[PDB]
From a paper:
In vitro, the di-iron centers catalyze the oxidation of Fe2+ utilizing H2O2 (not O2) as an oxidant, suggesting Pa Dps functions to aid P. aeruginosa to survive H2O2-mediated oxidative stress.
The screening of crystallization conditions produced two crystal forms, prismatic crystals of a primitive orthorhombic form (Dps-o) and primitive cubic lattice crystals (Dps-c). Superposition of the Dps-c and Dps-c-Fe structures or Dps-o- and Dps-o-Fe shows that only small rearrangements of D64 and E68 side chains are required to bind the iron ions in the ferroxidase centers of Pa Dps.
Residue numbers in the entry:
A (entry chain C), B (entry chain A), C (entry chain E), D (entry chain D), E (entry chain L), F (entry chain B), ...: 1 to 155
The structure:
Amino acid sequence: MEINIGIGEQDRAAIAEGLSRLLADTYTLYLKTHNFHWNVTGPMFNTLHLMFEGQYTELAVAVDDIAERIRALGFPAPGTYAAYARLSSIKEEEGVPEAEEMIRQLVQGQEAVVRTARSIFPLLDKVSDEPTADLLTQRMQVHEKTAWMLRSLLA
Amino acid sequence: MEINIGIGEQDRAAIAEGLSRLLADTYTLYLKTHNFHWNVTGPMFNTLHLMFEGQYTELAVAVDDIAERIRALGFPAPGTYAAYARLSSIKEEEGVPEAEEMIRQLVQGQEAVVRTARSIFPLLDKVSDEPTADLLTQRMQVHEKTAWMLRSLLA
Amino acid sequence: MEINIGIGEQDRAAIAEGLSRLLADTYTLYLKTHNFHWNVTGPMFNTLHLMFEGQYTELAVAVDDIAERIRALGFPAPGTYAAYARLSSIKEEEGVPEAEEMIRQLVQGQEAVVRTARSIFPLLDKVSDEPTADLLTQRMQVHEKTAWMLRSLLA
Amino acid sequence: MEINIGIGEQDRAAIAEGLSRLLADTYTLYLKTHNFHWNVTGPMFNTLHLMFEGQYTELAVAVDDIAERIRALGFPAPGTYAAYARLSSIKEEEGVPEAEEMIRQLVQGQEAVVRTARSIFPLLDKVSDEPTADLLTQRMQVHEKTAWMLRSLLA
Amino acid sequence: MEINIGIGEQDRAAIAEGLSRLLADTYTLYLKTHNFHWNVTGPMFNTLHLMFEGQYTELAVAVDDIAERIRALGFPAPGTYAAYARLSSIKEEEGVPEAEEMIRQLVQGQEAVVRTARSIFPLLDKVSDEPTADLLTQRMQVHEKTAWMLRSLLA
Amino acid sequence: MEINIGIGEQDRAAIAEGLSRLLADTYTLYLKTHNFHWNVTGPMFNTLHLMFEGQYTELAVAVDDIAERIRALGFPAPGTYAAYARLSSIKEEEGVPEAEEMIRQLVQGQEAVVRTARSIFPLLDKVSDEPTADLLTQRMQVHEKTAWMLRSLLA
Amino acid sequence: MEINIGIGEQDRAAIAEGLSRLLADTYTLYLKTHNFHWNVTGPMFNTLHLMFEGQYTELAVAVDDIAERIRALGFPAPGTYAAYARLSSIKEEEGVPEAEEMIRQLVQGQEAVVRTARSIFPLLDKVSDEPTADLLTQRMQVHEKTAWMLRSLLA
Amino acid sequence: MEINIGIGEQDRAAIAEGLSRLLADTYTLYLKTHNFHWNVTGPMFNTLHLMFEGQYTELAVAVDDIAERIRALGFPAPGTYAAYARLSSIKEEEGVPEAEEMIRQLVQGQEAVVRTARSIFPLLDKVSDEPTADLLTQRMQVHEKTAWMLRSLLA
Amino acid sequence: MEINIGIGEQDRAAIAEGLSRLLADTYTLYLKTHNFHWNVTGPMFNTLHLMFEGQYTELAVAVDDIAERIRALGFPAPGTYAAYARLSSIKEEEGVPEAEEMIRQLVQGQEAVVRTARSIFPLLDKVSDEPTADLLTQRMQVHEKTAWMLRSLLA
Amino acid sequence: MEINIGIGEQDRAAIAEGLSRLLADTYTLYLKTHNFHWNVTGPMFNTLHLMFEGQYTELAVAVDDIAERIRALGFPAPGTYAAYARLSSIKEEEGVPEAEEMIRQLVQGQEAVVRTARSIFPLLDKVSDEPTADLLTQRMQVHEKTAWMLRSLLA
Amino acid sequence: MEINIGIGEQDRAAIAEGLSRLLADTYTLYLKTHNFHWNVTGPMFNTLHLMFEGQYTELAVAVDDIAERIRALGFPAPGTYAAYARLSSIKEEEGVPEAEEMIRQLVQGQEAVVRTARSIFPLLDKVSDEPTADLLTQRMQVHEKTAWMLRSLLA
Amino acid sequence: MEINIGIGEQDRAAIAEGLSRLLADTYTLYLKTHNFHWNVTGPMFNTLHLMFEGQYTELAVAVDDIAERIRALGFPAPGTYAAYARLSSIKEEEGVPEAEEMIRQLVQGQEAVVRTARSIFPLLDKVSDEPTADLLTQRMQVHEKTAWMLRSLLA
């Protein structure tokens, strides 16, 4: 069946490309936070184990919201290590850093996701894709809130 | 008591007219989804019975949200067979189609509501009615997602 | 697959014809109660807004219960504006009446549906259909309770 | 301690005999549906595994209800293989049918239970035992609804 | 506002009279059960304390269901020590019986309400009050089940 | 087994006598409030029906708490229409008054229970019984709050 | 840590300034609604006590959402009587008005917050801060709906 | 599809054979427990009625666990009166024992299922089937706990 | 309607005057704790953010309990910035102090509320008001527990 | 940080010393009840196993409430076998008594805790500590209710 | 702090190496199950979307249980694309297979993970690590159940 | 009644002796953790107060599982300060250690319970008591997981 939601094929494919990067960054942050949750140590273990659990639990939902938006625009949602590594703008971390470096990286992750989100809006201004704009707007709100809480731990 | 929400009377009347149409399309789709939930048969009875239940349940909430916005703008919400049939752009189905054709009509229902939502946006760009704009955007998001799920059944 | 529930096909069609009138009446009362919920104003707004919401919530379920009984007898459940307008004995209200008149029209609604339920018990006395009789009895119980609560407001 | 619930020893013993058969048929249908739940296969596995789960879960509650009604009349509830075999009018399936055949057997089982229920009403239209009559009506309504949904799968 | 439910004044008044006696018996049983809940002692304290709690908590809900049927019929529901003492057929226990005598009196209290409900049916066999008939049926069901669990303890 | 809770037997019998009068007054208000819930009419039906429901639901818990203190003191809790009529200081309403009169009677009822509770403190100053004193205090708190809400309706 | 969320310091500070005024108006409406909840009397006590409870409960959540947006932007959230009095545009009520005047002031309060939200959009017109714009939009949605329900009581 | 879980076809069938005797004993215990729940009488009625309910409720879930493991092993789960009467080692009981006898038989029932579970372990010590060994362990745990509770009643 | 709860008008006005200061202190501590929740930073952000949330959430319930006690005494509850600034003994914090200093101030706030509560008991000793005494006792219990938890952080 | 709750240090130490003895008696009673829970046998096993579970579950919360008041008073709460053996006035049972003797010991233990609580009131009359007095009063209420329930079993 | 759990460091690092491959396999099957949930199409969309959702949601919890057993053994848990790509015996799928092939790959996945788990039992035999043994037994049980449900769709 | 569960008297008594040691260490760790919950102070008060609460809460369910295993084996469960002091290997702490020392001591406690569990495996692998073996395995999993979380704070 045809897709007649008021956005053309070329435009939907361009939007699904931007959301593919958003999905990649969000998944990479998800896995990193999940990593730090398991591996953080030190006097802040109890509070960071719990904080990081709240964050990756939220990001597991966020990846679903973004993948389902791509599917609604008529495109397959990427979902492999290789696809995400190619699309992610987020530097992975292969070691076990100190808790304060874990905080600092999670802050930069949040702001990396915000950067990818903002990069997509210019595309949307020419088109009218109002649902996608609102998904970006919600992801931005969540990540900027999480950044304040994470960096507060460092002031 | 006068209404001072930052939008004048003529303009609030025009937005309510547009949302009256949205309300009529959403109600007409609700009743058709409800109709197909009762009447669908075949090997996909169970899966479509359940699927259309989730959709008409969602749409019953949506008709309240659209009608409450009309009231917040200062106008009565339409609510009769005669008013919805006059205002609706959705084609009614008086018979009992095959399951696949039920699916196909409900895809075009989703897209018909999105088209009605898109037609109201020029009016909000000339004024500023940000709450109504967000309402339209949430409806488009729901309908576009439901359209992907429905037509995936037809691949 | 044939139907062997101890009621013949033309006898089940007769029961379904009456249930289709009960359904059309129940669904017209649903949408009118829903209408009045949105549209009532005045000093009784809070209490009536809430009272009508409880009623139309109950009636969205009753609509399903009646429709599924039609399907259990082996006939399609009607589900369109034209079908309900044809089969309904409840006259719609196309405008916005004062709250006391809304109350009055809904009392008479309740008593209308009780009449239609009662119009079916002759048929069931000839044809033994004890589940359908229980359904009619439950609808009468609810509509009579509701008429008491409604008319208590006018005493 | 004596029993004075308005129904004499002889009649309670009769109604109890009917319910003993209703119980045996409901329990036989219970185990058959449970069987088919575990054992069904093919591309409708997800649907039928779930549908038959809901039915056997309901039927577990039904056997309790029926057994307690027998205890209220003042007689023991049958509850052994030998007693259910002898009292049952539903034949069990000792092998593993194909999915469509499982459906057909379950439809027929619903109808067998409905038949056993009617067989009890005459015993009641002579006496006055309105609680037992309501129990049969409820069982009849559940099994006829289930019959519709099961047979809808074979259209 | 006139009451138009298909029963009409003097019939409704007779049924209300019947239901008033059922309410008085039910409230009288509710209080006696409450009383025995507080006051029972001996090695069966815990199980009877809890069992009579289940019963009076149920009866508290039943007095509401009965009262509201009197009101849907259009008559005031009785609610004083004098109205109930006049209308009730249960003998009140002003002292503190042994546990086995409490059980025995509660059994007879159940059969007292069934007996009062049976008294009322003939008058429905004339009028076609199906909701009231269904209320009487549910109360007979509960008291008959409760009689079995109570007298089981004496065996 | 003997009772050794720091209060002699005739002193516990005097406290229990005072609490029996409190139970009788609270039960009488329970049933009067319950009566008025069923029977109130007028434009305040919905709000008084609901307000009186909250009150009798709370009072049903109160009668259990008071009865159980009598039992903890080693004396039986009264629980018959005759004992409560002998013990209570509140008068029942045998008719159906207007809603404003219903409100006024319930105000005076709360204030009557407060007085009965006050009347027991001189005893408790002679006899140390801190749990009972806290029970009286809690009932005084509830009835004074409830008096405020009721009498606000009359301002 | 630096804050890199795609908005510069001086724009973040100007936006936090506007949100501080929104927070002040929202907290002042919170306390006013809370006050009226406690203090309202007359025949509408029950429905207005409840309605204002719903509003102040919602506003308590809203002040957290607004304050946390100011924090996410990197500035302190104001939280004292003096700071809110300085920034607020709502006129406080030091007495206890009649119920209808309470409703009227709460309508004007809703319209006051909406007005303050609007005054911030031209500054998000220069810098792109979509999360803040969606917050304002949600607050406008809530207050325009609440104004409808409040005004309706005065019709 | 090939079943490739590291157990050979003949070994799985011998495991399934063992599990099938377990299922038969559990199901026979389930129905005997259910039966005794319905039929026990005397002073211990409430405590045993409830005790056996918790037991049969647990057993209803165990039969599902056993059956699903047989299917995980690639074999049909048995599900008839005949297949269970043949595989079960549990003396069925066709009358109504005194409560002490009922408790005794249920104790032997527990130990019988334990004996059957132990009889499968030699087979398990020659084949790597750790999940099946875990299922036997959990069943042995439940039945030995239940044995203690039931025989404590006879101390 | 006249208030007859056993306390004269001027004696109630004096109790209400003391509870009005307790309310202003409790409310000022509410806003300060809320303020500190939003604005605290450093390595104890997560733990203090959460702890202060639990506190301001509790205090919001407390201000309702105190304000309802004033209404039960027959006087209006204060509820403005100017009333609370006038009646409060707790000074507000207009800046953003260090985490340690926030903790210290909240310890001192708890202790200030205990002194205001304590200050009211001499009036209650002259005027019997046991409910108010219980209210003050409960606030003292909570603030003393909270003070332990806060000052433990500084050991 | 200093403690200023209006009680001097040696006076708090005296209250804490009383509460430490209450804690030790509550904990000793907790473990004894827990032990009897596990070990009781005979025809009352089901009812006493459950009753004792209710009791030890309540006492576990009590030991927390008592310990936290000691901490609010500024002193360490005891918690070792040696500390409780020293401070406790309740003797432990090293064996396994007959059920009737378990009930007796638990009655005695309830009354033992009441006595320990009573004994702290002279101190509280000389130094004002209203929270602790309330705690003692609640403990006395709970243990007096429990002693009624327990000793009713021995009548 | 040193680790003294009865398992030397050499043996712990070897169990950790095994558990890391299990984690990498469990994670890869997690993301692949997640990927197919978003991307499956055709007439089995509803049933598979849901069935896969249930699978990856379970798998998300399994990766936590596994990573945390690694931590309890005292080693870091891998958590990056490179580490899982390196350790994973599960084969990536970079495109969009037909529904039947998705089912096929997921059966393979379940079996691969059972393979990795079985591979580790030698170490736990040599050692005694009963907690890790129980984790592998639980994963094998889950994945063998899932393979049954998946492959049943293809029968 | 005899005990026949596949293990002889002498063998079970030996298992009950080792589980008595396990119950004593587990109860001793429970009280010690509970003590440290009340008594810990310093900047980690909040996280340790909460972490120790989750642990003592878990252990309270453990001692029930161990005591009931002993009962199922046919032996009385030990339950006194002297019994546990005799059988326990945990060193009791009579002081109030600094927070870091409390953590260290609870680590050692976890490891101590593991030791007692391991010591039981040689027995029972001479018998075949798999329920007991699985009980030991569950406790080892919890204590080893908890030991990781505790020692992470000391890193």
